From Swiss-Prot:
It comes from Mus musculus. The modification Phosphoserine is found at residue 11. ANK repeats lie at residues 2-44, 45-91, 92-123. The gene is Trpv2. Abundantly expressed in spleen, placenta, skeleton muscle, lung and brain. N-glycosylated. Phosphorylated by PKA. This is Transient receptor potential cation channel subfamily V member 2. The chain holds residues 67 to 189 of 756 of the full protein.
């Protein structure tokens, strides 16, 4: 079950159970891959798993938000998903903090900004 795909993680963060996230650490190091490079993001737009978790909050809460960032932090690229933005012409520059604000979620904004989220990234 170490092997992971785009749609699997998309569904996992959609459901909102954090226990199923376990196992990503081994896979992210067996292939020497990072969550931003080519791991889990839609090719058409550039939309990543974090936003997929943030586009659906069950009554304004998602447990899966809590671990995943340090899942990036321990073994991630210099960009901590704040500089990872969609490459869709209609939707360029729109980062996860923008979803967090527009979803009217103050907690997500708190977590992102205290986890190193640049604010000068114009969408």
């Amino acid at each position: 079950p170490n092997r992971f795909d785009r749609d699997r993680l998309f569904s996992v963060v959609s459901r909102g159970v954090p226990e199923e996230l376990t196992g990503l650490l081994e896979y992210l190091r067996r292939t020497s891959k990072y969550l931003t490079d080519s791991a889990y993001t839609e090719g058409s737009t550039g939309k990543t798993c974090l936003m997929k978790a943030v586009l659906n909050l069950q009554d304004g809460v998602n447990a899966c938000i809590l671990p995943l960032l340090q899942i990036d932090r321990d073994s991630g690229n210099p960009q901590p998903l704040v500089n990872a933005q969609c490459t869709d012409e209609f939707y360029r520059g729109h980062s996860a903090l923008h979803i967090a604000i527009e979803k009217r979620s103050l907690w997500c904004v708190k977590l992102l900004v205290e986890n190193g989220a640049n604010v000068h990234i114009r969408a």
